[PDB]
Symmetry: C5
Subunit: 165 residues, 5 copies
Amino acid sequence: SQQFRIDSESIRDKLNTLLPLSGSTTIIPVVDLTETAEGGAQREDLQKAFTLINTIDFDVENTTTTIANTPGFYKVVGNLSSRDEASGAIAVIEVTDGITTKILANNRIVSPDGTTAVQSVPVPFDLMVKLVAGDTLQARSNNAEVRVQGIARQIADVSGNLINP
Amino acid sequence: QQFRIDSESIRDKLNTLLPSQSRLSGSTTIIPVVDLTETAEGGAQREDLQKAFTLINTIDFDVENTTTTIANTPGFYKVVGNLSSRDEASGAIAVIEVTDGITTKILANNRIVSPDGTTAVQSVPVPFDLMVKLVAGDTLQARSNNAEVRVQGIARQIADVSGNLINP
Amino acid sequence: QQFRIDSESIRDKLNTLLPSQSLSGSTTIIPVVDLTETAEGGAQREDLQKAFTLINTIDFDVENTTTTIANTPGFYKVVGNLSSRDEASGAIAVIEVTDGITTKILANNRIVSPDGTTAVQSVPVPFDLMVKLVAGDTLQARSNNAEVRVQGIARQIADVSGNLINP
Amino acid sequence: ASQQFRIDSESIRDKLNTLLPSVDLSGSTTIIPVVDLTETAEGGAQREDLQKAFTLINTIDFDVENTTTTIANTPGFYKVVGNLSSRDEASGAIAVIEVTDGITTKILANNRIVSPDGTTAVQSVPVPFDLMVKLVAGDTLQARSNNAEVRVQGIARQIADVSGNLINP
Amino acid sequence: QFRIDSESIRDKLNTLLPSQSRVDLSGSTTIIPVVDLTETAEGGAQREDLQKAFTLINTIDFDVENTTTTIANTPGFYKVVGNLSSRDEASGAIAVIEVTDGITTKILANNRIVSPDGTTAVQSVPVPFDLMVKLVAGDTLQARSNNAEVRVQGIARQIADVSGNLINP
Ligand code: NA
Ligand code: NA
Ligand code: NA
Ligand code: NA
């Protein structure tokens, strides 16, 4: 095990801010105990799991229903009833503050040709939405013939702290 | 080499990471390493590998006009598959739901299509791909209320209720 | 210097990680560079490591037969489509795993439920699976009818012990 | 010291030389347990799924019919997700996502894809897209529909500046 | 400070660190805190989603009808995403993504997949693909349509060189 001097200001700069140069010729095999030392891993797929208690289930027809309206990060997944882009029947996921509204998932998308018999399919969505104070995430159907369906849960608080399942 | 470290941040972390049985500096020599952690843990720790389906671990289901339990013991479960789409006004229901016998929540729903100008309603698969955590008393199930619709797919237990990974 | 550690969890993990038929911490922080990726042959990021090549690709297009995709131990990625049929159809197209005794379907085509019509339109039914085979296991594609197909590609991602196979 | 061995690997030697520019490599036979303080020392970056979240303030919402609509035209990284109205491959009705500098244009999501047979009654479905696009100076990301019958619908947001610095949600 | 009993670990170390002149492995009970400088040493890195972004300059756009069109034919890792025109599995109209070396060819995305029943009016939908392909010397990634009625549409870009070195967007 010997040392050689390094020429690199970036590494030197990086190290300085890390802990307020030379290299070794011997490669050391290691095992990393960091996760165990921290109290156990928080693998993302598990942390975001749906539970009976945490699931915000929704199935909206001819009404407007709030999915969430408290600050934080939310996963939202589901489907809309597709309609002709020329249709008046709206089934959307939207966010609003009572002043403006933005559609995050839109159903009025199909463009049939040569027929008035318009088949419909689910339009999927899978979104991560952050709400601040005064914001509402909602599902809106304006017509008895279309639905907005799915599930949501709060993934983190507004400060970005993860919420256990 | 060796210099002194001033970090409340690093000091506090190092002491939480490595608790002392009893009531900091840095080196200026960079050490090249190789990491054997994954092998030491038994291999196949990368998420895609660890979550793999096997003949032994696969909970296969294909549900028509009945209710079928996928899991009813605590843990984390991956569940993937399809439902038969129907009109949003149909009586033919195919769902994935979670329940404790008191509250029930649908996680995947088939009643979604909205045809116009026709009574000949075409159907497509409605996919789902879910991670569900069950605690004591919870059931994950597939349910079809009609011989004309199915809920089909596969599931497996990914981890125990405390998050410990289950190796396939 | 060094100091004794009181952590039952850390002690247990270290015992498990580095088994021996036979605990402290340091206060000096060591800067490192990690050569593991190069030592493994490079291109270890998951998207690169799992790439398909002309040589490694198990291509399949199965009609009215059973075709083995893999039958040796390891982890396999398998992706593709089935021909959708009515949920009451006799025309079956599946991905399944079997040991010659038990068989489980991993992807199923018999899913659509038309109403008010006998003219049944069909779409691809996609699948994207990670399957681990052990000794004696076969992953296969099967179509029982000339009208339906199982199409796709697969490759071996790792050996049965989890060691990655580079493309 | 625990027993060491000479490592014979040009790739590892060359890599170490580029990493740590001014060797005869050796390896050690003792496995050392470590804990990593890098994240603690660095700042503690936000998990990607959270960092990329859509908000009422940050979302570039679009619903485009018979017009060309800019999604972004300043440098940076943008996530753009949504759907196009499918049409027959021989259709004249175009609904696309495209990037352009005014000299050339590339379609990143194309709607004219279906190939019906045995019928002139052509059903349509959404054609989804989910893209990460980097714009440099002079580039425009846009949604374009050339006809009242087809739409481009979706959302976008700026994920990072052109230097790769992440933007908070 | 202690002997390790693990053939799996010993074999792994031996593979990682080759030695022509090739012993008991050992472990230490002293946990060492580290910081990882690798990213800075490599010149810096970008998060994967940003690194893989499409740009006007890097995008290989294709819209293929009744011809064979090369997407890439030099070594490297390529992301390729897009759609094929679906047809009946019994159709003669082919739209595929394939890889070839001029002797062997394999289809990576296939359009002839639908199985209508009780009708000769066969509706078509996009068949999506999203692939990572590694080409070595002599390999070609291509889109092929054998009929004017079917298309292969999409975008691709080179993600890394053949050794895995990442290409900046
Ligand atoms: Na209704
Ligand atoms: Na039935
Ligand atoms: Na056939
Ligand atoms: Na219109």
